[PDB]
Design a protein around this ligand. Structure first.
Ligand code: F6C
Ligand code: CLA
Ligand code: CLA
Ligand code: CLA
Ligand code: CLA
Ligand code: CLA
Ligand code: CLA
Ligand code: CLA
Ligand SMILES: CC1=C(/C=C/C(C)=C/C=C/C(C)=C/C=C/C=C(C)/C=C/C=C(C)/C=C/C2=C(C)CCCC2(C)C)C(C)(C)CCC1
Ligand SMILES: CC1=C(/C=C/C(C)=C/C=C/C(C)=C/C=C/C=C(C)/C=C/C=C(C)/C=C/C2=C(C)CCCC2(C)C)C(C)(C)CCC1
Ligand SMILES: CC1=C(C/C=C(\C)CCC[C@H](C)CCC[C@H](C)CCCC(C)C)C(=O)c2ccccc2C1=O
Ligand SMILES: [Ca+2]
Lengths: 172, 31, 42, 139, 75, 74, 753, 80, 42
């Protein structure tokens, strides 16, 4: 007389284990969600840790310049606004990379505690070695600096780019 | 008097609905 | 003036960014996705 | 290895976490006379099977709560056992420790942490300064 | 402007009588529990509860139709 | 300070447990606590709440004492 | 046959023996007191009926009888308002000059100088200016003299006695069986068509035949004595036809479906009456008439005894996958199946839902009555308008907290895991960490992006950098979606084009369409929304979401958590599970209600503060002959409310002048109560910041002194329990804070309103 | 770990053992009381410090005392 | 002029660099030092 009706349940236990504190939902287990998340540079199969950090830093440093350019305290002048946005991205990224370094220093002593231990099976935290974290950190810093400067150069030359993207450079 | 900025933005958001449904149909046909 | 691309229509900045996006920004990443799709081992 | 069939459960958010795979985990096994609905210690309802069941739980208190307040008190099931499982695979049965429930006196059990005096005769802490001995641990 | 309402005429009687009759044909053969309670041909032999329900809903739907038509100049 | 003094520990420990679950199940969050996050102890909460209460007590009156006298005099 | 009346005859003898047996309802309390904790437990468990007995049928009978007792209390209170408005009021003087007389219905005796509180309220009368809006309500009902109020006062007392006899009768003489209480379909049919439907129809009859004729004459300017009594409009049909020609046709247009003839007294105007500033009584008559038909029709939805109708069980058992919408199938293959068991046995679950919907109803009452003032001379009575909004906002907040409280009681006591196997209730509990973690995150997002931007504004303003502030003149945060709705609703009536052509005036002038003035004061005008309104509305979003977080965590974790897995066995209301596990203080669902009460107070205080300041700044004021409006606070909301220094200075400090300078005047009572509220708030902090262990030890030394003098009581003095100290602390805290705001609001409005 | 001590005033009512939510206590043979048994705490490593045992103890003063000490994962009641 | 931070005292360039150093340049490295100190395994 008891019918759990699990066989016809739209939401299943995650990965077939009902006692792993997770559900099989559209966000966690749909084919598109898995394809997108598992192919981000943090999870893409076969990537070296440095190459993971390079792509992550490139994307994050690029967009971190923007907020202070538009609503920052130097927004009244274009040249000052761009510099403040570049410095803000540099300061944030260097602070993050410093935190990543001290994370690697403190986490990987003996057998790491928590999700980075030898017997841990955290599929969402696959960087299990201290060397991988330092290689990732090098890519994060260099990518963030390059992405921030790339946004800085485009914003600094915005008058040239605006003429470029309108064909105004074809007058002469 | 052509359409306004709000109408263009509304059409862009509305077009997302057939965009997501086209993806759902394309993947379903791929099965 | 007729020395630049302009638009009197609403949100004329949209072609300013959408033409580069579809035609020479996104297509190479799109080709990369298709190339990965058609080369995946069984 | 621990044998038994897991109760019918569709999944929940109160299950095991990283601690189960890193430090320790607990398993409670019991035999039921019929298929019936019980309450998971961390929320939700599960269906225990006809035969012998096996449930993985994050803390030892979950097993004492489930076995003591539900299996014994409500379902009249008195054969539940709690095991501590380590990541290396070592499994030890911890409840009931000697096969007899603790509330029932059993021969051969020694007195542990027994103080041969009433609690009002504990020495003052001033007498035990710099010795590292607490008043309740004093002879 | 106030929506137009028409004086009583055989047309409004026809609409209400027809709406009640169509509902009687449908309800006696479509609702979940007809033939419940005291009994009253082509109909499925509806009960007194089903019949009163059909006539009451015929007044509700009929009033909506006649008011809607008169509002719009016969729609 | 009123938060530390009125609300007590067990409420926050249960809330922290929920946030612990969220962190473990969120992708891209490579950080992980070396020290398990727990709610402040019962005694610690009284001390922390008393510190906020005292600091707010001194700061509020000190600002009022200086401003109401210096604003009307030298 | 299924729906029937089954009762028991004389189930409980009517004897006063148990009156002399305090605590008889509880087994523990029946033995008598040994400590003072027994006294508190007696009052704490007085109305916890499900702990008196486990018989659901006996519990339900107690609910039914006690509800008649509460109805008797309300009728006595209503009779008091009508009697005091007929014996100790200036109601007749106010009816002649509504715009130049302050309503007053309370008069104090002269013994200790308290007669100074008899204010000069106009009309040759001395008394306390009331802010309940009784006069405006009575005028809209057609009442014109104190004799009619006196008759209603007597009728209220008679109804109170009838209610009291009904409770005694239906508990001690004829108590219905449990099967009677479980008729969901019959109860809904009778309460939809028979209570809401017939009441709307009956009040529509009163409005059409009494309220509209009397109010039409009043708004035309005729004297009170020249207006005929309400029954004259029923007997002499010639009078009623002069006011509205369509009554010359009698009932013929109604039965012939020619209702357009009735358009002269069932109007659909919208807007406000220019003479009085309230809604058109003809508009409300057609509103209530449409409600009566809609409710009565709704009262034939459920299947009782004749096959026709819908069944609650069939509807609930069908709402599950795959019968749902394709994007709504996540509720699982069981869905709402099994929820019917909740409503068969759990009174607390129904009380949870119903208290929530009184919070919803009272919130709608607060918002919709200021923007669409339904009574004559209500909008321009600023003291009454502020009091009515504030009162009903506060009532809603307590009801909402009560709904969450009894939802937790249901989970601890009435919830049965066997009834909920993979259904929506079971699934909600199984992803409670998902819900609470996301709710915790959105609370932090809202707190950072609502309050911390106020701190940003304070720092920018202090720096002398107004251009960097979040303001209309700096970094703008325009509430474009709310502005768009105002434009849509204004263009709907003709003031997404004309989507409501039938309404002439704007539905509410708060959205636009013009300004209405009555006695040289603004009744309603467009309420523009800018950056300051964007910030304050997201303050409301933040505070509400946190109050939800506190209460909803308590309900979802009432059974237990990862910390204490067996809280359900510990009960709904227990102090803790000891200092172990690091400390488990206030884990029970009861302390989540206790903590949620503070957050409801904090949230609602800013709601009534937002209302009070915005209305004084941008709506209320005086209109000169040229149509120029000077507002009560001169439009300072836009620039001063964007910082909490502006709230501290321009709202709390500036607007408290009336209450702070009310000594030696008729408003001195508000000044005294202003300090009284401050005292109780500080007094409550003693209970909240301390613990009973200290107080019990202190009582030990005090008991020693009484023992030394042979005067120690037999009932041993005990410190309040841990839960009791929390209950006392929160009760005095909310009482002190609310009384402080009450005196602050009323003193200012009784002076400048 | 917490320290749980049992004193000679124990009457062997087994109420502390039944109240323990983590099975720290067991009843062992004894001769100091009529019940011929006394509470023991062999598994104090599993003690969380809830002091449910002290609440259940009927003697005055308590025959069982819990002294909160060094905090471990299982003494803090942590499932993570 | 009163549009900028200045100093008439000697070496007014010292606050120009010491305030950034103590308050938003060095504190994060200092926190890193303390964090490494309080997390070191025995
Ligand atoms: C380390 C690492 C890490 C990570 C990664 O890796 C993380 C992540 C996550 C995710 C998943 C999420 C989402 C995010 C957000 O939005 O929120 C946040 C924000 C932020 C900003 C956070 C932050 C981030 C990071 C930290 C970064 C860092 C960097 C820096 C810069 C460094 C610097 C250094 C120097 C030396 C100073 C979360 C969260 C949460 N948190 Mg969590 N984290 C962590 C840390 C931490 C700590 C320490 C604490 C204590 C304070 C907490 C807290 C908290 C709370 C309360 C909550 C909530 O509510 C949320 C949630 O759940 O939802 C749902 N948490 N997080
Ligand atoms: C049309 C029929 C009808 C009406 C009007 C009501 C009305 C009411 N019921 Mg009810 N009930 C009904 C049928 C009806 N019931 C049936 C058939 C059942 C069985 C399924 C129940 C079972 C039931 C329960 C179990 C409970 C109620 C309760 C209530 C009260 C809710 C409180 C409220 O809103 O105050 C409304 C305030 C008023 C002043 C309304 C008037 C009150 C009097 C008694 C109504 C007299 C109307 C009568 C026709 C005389 C009219 C005179 C004149 C107009 C001609 C309310 C008085 C609750 C309560 O409080 O009980 C006391 C409650 O617990 N009812
Ligand atoms: C229709 C509304 C309604 C009903 C029928 C109930 C019914 C019940 N509630 Mg409930 N509740 C409600 C609304 C309601 N509540 C609301 C709105 C809230 C939010 C504040 C609560 C919060 C609440 C809690 C937190 C608890 C209950 C409990 C209970 C149960 C026992 C009643 C009790 O303890 O006696 C009441 C006895 C008292 C001594 C209270 C009187 C003291 C009040 C607080 C003082 C009020 C101050 C006064 C108005 C102003 C100042 C006065 C002046 C002299 C200074 C009972 C089933 C208790 C329970 O065990 O449930 C199973 C419980 O723990 N309720
Ligand atoms: C099948 C014939 C029919 C027709 C032509 C209408 C036509 C109309 N009905 Mg109607 N109605 C009908 C059947 C019909 N009804 C039935 C069977 C019922 C059930 C009793 C109703 C119940 C009903 C109600 C309750 C209302 C209408 C209203 C209206 C008017 C809405 C005007 C508009 O454009 O709003 C467009 C609205 C939106 C796009 C939104 C319109 C004249 C409304 C009215 O009175 O308008 C003046 C109204 O309030 N109808
Ligand atoms: C939608 C319902 C509704 C609305 C908008 C009104 C509106 C009005 N009524 Mg009215 N009334 C109603 C229902 C309603 N009534 C019912 C059901 C009865 C009894 C049967 C009455 C009896 C009544 C009397 C006796 C009097 C009024 C008066 C008035 C006017 C004064 C303002 C007021 O009452 O606050 C407006 C109220 C609201 C904005 C909301 C409250 C209405 C209910 C509680 C909403 C319930 C919705 C709920 C939260 C959702 C339920 C859950 C859902 C699943 C269904 C105003 C025009 C007075 C007057 O003279 O008019 C000028 C007056 O003396 N009314
Ligand atoms: C629900 C309560 C109620 C009650 C008790 C009455 C009672 C009455 N109405 Mg009335 N009426 C009501 C609602 C009500 N009406 C509503 C909702 C409308 C709007 C459709 C009307 C529209 C109406 C008209 C147009 C007339 C009456 C008239 C009358 C009187 C004689 C009717 C008769 O017995 O036949 C009587 C005093 C008649 C009368 O005597 O006029 C004063 C009359 O001509 N009524
Ligand atoms: C003004 C006093 C105050 C403040 C600031 C808070 C703040 C908070 N309470 Mg709280 N509380 C208070 C009084 C206060 N409470 C009182 C008196 C009570 C008793 C009833 C409670 C009861 C209570 C409960 C029961 C709950 C909270 C919750 C929360 C959090 C809500 C999330 C949020 O807003 O994140 C944003 C954070 C803020 C708005 C805090 C101010 C941040 C400032 C403005 C910016 C700081 C800038 C920068 C970071 C400074 C760094 C400099 C460096 C040197 C340190 C937040 C930490 C809830 C929670 O934890 O949910 C997540 C919750 O459940 N509180
Ligand atoms: C304890 C004494 C003390 C205190 C509280 C301050 C306070 C201040 N100094 Mg200062 N200073 C001091 C002694 C002190 N000074 C001495 C003795 C010297 C000569 C070497 C200076 C030279 C100096 C310069 C050159 C400047 C300041 C500045 C400042 C201001 C910003 C902080 C800063 O940049 O520090 C800078 C600090 C130093 C360069 C050296 C400080 C040396 C003292 C002795 C260290 C004291 C450590 C303390 C006792 C240990 C704390 C223990 C902990 C538990 C609290 C601030 C008002 C700045 C200013 O004026 O901004 C407007 C600035 O540019 N100071
Ligand atoms: C999910 C999704 C989405 C989102 C997205 C995003 C979020 C994006 C972003 C993006 C980004 C954010 C990007 C960025 C990128 C970047 C880049 C591309 C960069 C580059 C760089 C460079 C190239 C550099 C260079 C350099 C160096 C290295 C050194 C020297 C100098 C220089 C500058 C040369 C959407 C909603 C849409 C839709 C749905 C889905
Ligand atoms: C909300 C609230 C309130 C209230 C209010 C009011 C004012 C209400 C009202 C209500 C009402 C106002 C109701 C009514 C009802 C009615 C009814 C219920 C009726 C019935 C009727 C009938 C039943 C009839 C019958 C008949 C006869 C007798 C003869 C002929 C036939 C016929 C059938 C017609 C208060 C403030 C107090 C409190 C708080 C809350
Ligand atoms: C003050 C306080 C006490 C002490 C309060 C007690 C013991 C209650 C005292 C109630 C008294 C006896 C009620 C009567 C007081 C009236 C003012 C007496 C009127 C006398 C007339 C002649 C006027 C606690 O017990 C407590 C417990 C837990 C947390 C906080 C606290 C706490 O803060
Ligand atoms: Ca060129």
């Amino acid at each position: 007389k008891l019918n759990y009706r699990l066989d016809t349940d739209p939401v299943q236990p995650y990965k077939g284990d009902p006692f792993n504190s997770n559900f099989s939902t559209a966000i966690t287990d749909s084919p598109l969600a898995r394809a997108f998340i598992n192919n981000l540079p943090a999870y893409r199969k076969g990537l070296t840790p440095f190459m993971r950090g390079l792509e992550i830093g490139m994307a994050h440093g690029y967009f971190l310049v923007g907020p202070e350019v538009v609503v920052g305290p130097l927004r009244e002048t274009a040249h000052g606004a761009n510099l403040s946005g570049l410095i803000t991205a540099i300061y944030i990224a260097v602070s993050a990379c410093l935190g990543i370094s001290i994370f690697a220093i403190t986490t990987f002593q003996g057998d790491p505690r928590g999700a980075y231990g030898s017997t841990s099976k955290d599929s969402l935290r696959p960087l299990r070695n201290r060397d991988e974290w330092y290689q990732l950190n090098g890519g994060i810093f260099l990518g963030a600096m390059g992405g921030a400067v790339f946004a800085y150069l485009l914003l600094e030359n915005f008058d040239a780019l605006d003429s470029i993207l309108r064909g105004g450079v074809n007058v002469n | 008097m052509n359409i306004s900025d709000t109408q263009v933005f509304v059409a862009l958001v509305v077009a997302l609905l057939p965009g997501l449904l086209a993806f759902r149909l394309a993947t379903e046909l791929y099965k | 003036d007729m020395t630049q691309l302009t638009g009197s229509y609403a949100a004329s900045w949209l072609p300013w960014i959408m033409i580069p996006l579809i035609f020479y920004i996104l297509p190479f990443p799109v080709f990369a996705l298709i190339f990965i799709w058609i080369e995946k081992e069984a | 290895t621990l044998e038994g069939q897991t109760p019918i459960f569709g999944g929940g958010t109160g299950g095991l976490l990283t601690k189960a795979e890193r430090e320790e985990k607990y398993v409670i096994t019991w035999t039921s006379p019929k298929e019936q609905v019980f309450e998971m210690p961390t929320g939700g309802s599960a269906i225990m099977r006809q035969g012998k069941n096996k449930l993985e739980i994050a803390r030892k208190e979950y097993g004492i709560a489930l076995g003591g307040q539900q299996l014994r008190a409500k379902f009249k099931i008195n054969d539940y056992k709690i095991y501590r499982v380590y990541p290396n695979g070592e499994t030890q049965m911890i409840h009931p420790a000697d096969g007899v429930f603790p509330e029932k006196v059993n021969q051969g059990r020694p007195k542990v942490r027994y103080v041969d005096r009433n609690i009002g005769s504990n020495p003052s802490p001033a007498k035990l300064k710099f010795s590292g001995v607490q008043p309740y641990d004093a002879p | 402007t106030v929506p137009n309402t028409i004086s009583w005429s055989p047309q409004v009687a026809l609409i209400i009588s027809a709406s009640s009759l169509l509902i009687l044909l449908i309800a006696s053969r479509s609702i979940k529990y007809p033939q419940v309670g005291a009994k009253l041909p082509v109909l499925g032999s509806p009960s007194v509860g089903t019949f009163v329900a059909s006539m009451a809903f015929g007044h509700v739907v009929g009033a909506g139709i006649v008011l809607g038509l008169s509002n719009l100049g016969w729609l | 300070s009123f938060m530390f003094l009125i609300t007590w520990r067990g409420y926050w420990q249960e809330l922290i447990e929920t946030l612990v679950w969220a962190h473990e199940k969120t992708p891209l969050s490579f950080g992980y606590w070396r020290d398990k996050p727990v709610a402040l102890s019962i005694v610690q909460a009284r001390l922390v709440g008393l510190t906020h209460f005292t600091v707010g007590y001194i700061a509020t009156y000190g600002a009022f004492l200086i401003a109401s006298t210096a604003g009307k005099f030298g | 046959q299924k729906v029937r009346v089954v009762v028991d005859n004389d189930p409980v003898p009517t004897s006063p023996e148990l009156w002399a047996k305090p605590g008889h309802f509880d087994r523990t309390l029946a033995r008598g007191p040994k400590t003072t904790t027994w006294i508190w437990n007696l009052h704490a468990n007085a109305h916890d009926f499900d702990t008196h007995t486990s018989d659901l049928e006996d519990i339900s009978r107690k609910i039914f009888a006690a509800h008649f007792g509460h109805l008797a209390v309300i009728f006595i209170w209503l009779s008091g308002m009508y009697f005091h408005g007929a014996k100790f009021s200036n109601f007749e003087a106010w009816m002649a000059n509504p715009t130049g007389v302050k309503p007053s219905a309370q008069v104090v005796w002269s013994l200790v100088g308290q007669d100074i509180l008899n204010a000069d309220v106009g009309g040759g009368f001395h008394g306390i200016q009331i802010t309940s809006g009784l006069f405006q309500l009575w005028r809209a009902a057609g009442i014109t003299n104190t004799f009619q109020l006196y008759c209603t006062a007597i009728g209220g007392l008679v109804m109170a006695a009838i209610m009291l006899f009904a409770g005694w009768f239906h508990y001690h003489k004829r108590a219905p069986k449990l099967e009677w209480f479980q008729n969901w379909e019959a109860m809904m049919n009778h309460h939809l068509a028979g209570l809401l439907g017939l009441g709307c129809l009956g009040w529509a009859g009163h409005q059409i035949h009494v309220a509209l004729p009397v109010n039409k004459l009043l708004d035309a300017g005729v004297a009170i004595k020249d207006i005929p009594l309400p029954h004259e409009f029923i007997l002499n049909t010639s009078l009623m036809a002069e006011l509205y020609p369509s009554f010359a046709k009698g009932l013929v247009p109604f039965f012939t479906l020619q209702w357009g003839q009735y358009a002269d007294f069932l109007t659909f105007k919208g807007g406000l009456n220019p003479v009085t500033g309230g809604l058109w009584l003809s508009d409300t008559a057609h509103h209530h008439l449409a409600l009566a038909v809609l409710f009565i029709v709704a009262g034939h939805f459920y299947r009782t005894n004749w096959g026709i109708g819908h069944s609650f069980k069939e509807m609930l058992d069908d709402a599950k996958s795959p019968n749902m919408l394709p994007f709504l199938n996540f509720i699982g293959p069981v869905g709402h199946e099994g929820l019917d068991k909740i409503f068969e046995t759990s009174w607390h679950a129904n009380l949870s839902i119903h208290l929530v919907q009184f919070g919803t109803a009272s919130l709608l009452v607060a918002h919709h009555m200021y923007a669409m003032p339904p009574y004559p001379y209500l909008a321009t009575d600023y003291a009454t308008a502020l009091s009515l909004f504030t009162h009903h906002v506060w009532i809603a907040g307590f009801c909402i907290v009560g709904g969450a409280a009894h939802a937790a009681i249901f989970m601890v006591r009435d919830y049965d895991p066997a009834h909920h196997v993979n259904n929506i209730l079971d699934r909600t509990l199984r992803h409670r960490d998902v819900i609470i973690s996301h709710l915790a995150w959105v609370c932090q997002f809202l707190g950072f992006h609502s309050f911390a931007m106020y701190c940003h504004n304070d720092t920018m303003r202090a720096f002398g950098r107004p251009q960097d502030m979040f303001s209309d003149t700096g970094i703008q945060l325009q509430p474009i979606f709310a502005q768009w709705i105002q434009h849509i609703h204004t263009a709907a009536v003709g003031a997404l084009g004309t989507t409501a052509p039938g309404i002439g005036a704007p539905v509410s002038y708060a959205w636009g369409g013009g300004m209405v003035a009555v006695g040289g004061k603004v009744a309603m005008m467009p309420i523009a929304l800018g950056t300051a309104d964007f910030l304050i509305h997201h303050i409301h979003a933040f505070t509400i979401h946190v109050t939800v977080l506190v209460l909803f965590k308590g309900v979802l974790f009432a059974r237990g958590s990862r910390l204490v897995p067996d809280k359900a066995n510990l009960g709904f209301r227990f102090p803790c599970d000891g200092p172990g596990r690091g400390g488990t203080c206030q884990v029970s669902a009861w302390d989540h209600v206790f903590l949620g009460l503070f957050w409801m107070y904090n949230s609602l205080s800013m709601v009534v503060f937002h209302f009070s300041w915005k209305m004084q700044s941008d709506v209320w004021g005086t209109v000169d002959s040229d149509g120029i409006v000077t507002h009560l606070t001169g439009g300072n909301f836009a620039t001063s409310s964007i910082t909490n220094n502006g709230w501290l200075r321009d709202f709390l400090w500036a607007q408290s002048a009336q209450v702070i300078q009310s000594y030696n005047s008729s408003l001195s009572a508000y000044g005294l109560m202003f300090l009284a509220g401050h005292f109780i708030f500080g007094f409550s902090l003693m209970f909240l910041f301390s613990g009973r262990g200290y107080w019990q030890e202190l009582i030990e030394s005090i008991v020693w002194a009484h023992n030394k003098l042979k005067v120690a009581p037999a009932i041993q003095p005990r410190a309040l329990s841990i839960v009791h100290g929390r209950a006392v602390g929160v009760a005095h805290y909310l009482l002190g804070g609310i009384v402080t705001t009450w005196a602050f609001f009323l003193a200012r409005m009784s002076a400048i309103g | 770990s917490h320290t749980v001590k049992i004193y000679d005033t124990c009457i062997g009512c087994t109420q502390c053992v039944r109240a323990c939510p983590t099975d720290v206590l067991e009843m062992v043979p004894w001769d100091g009381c009529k019940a011929a048994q006394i509470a023991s705490s062999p598994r104090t490593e599993d003690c969380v410090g809830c002091k449910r045992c002290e609440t259940a103890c009927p003697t005055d003063f308590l025959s069982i005392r819990v002294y909160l000490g060094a905090e471990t994962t299982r003494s803090m009641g942590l499932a993570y």
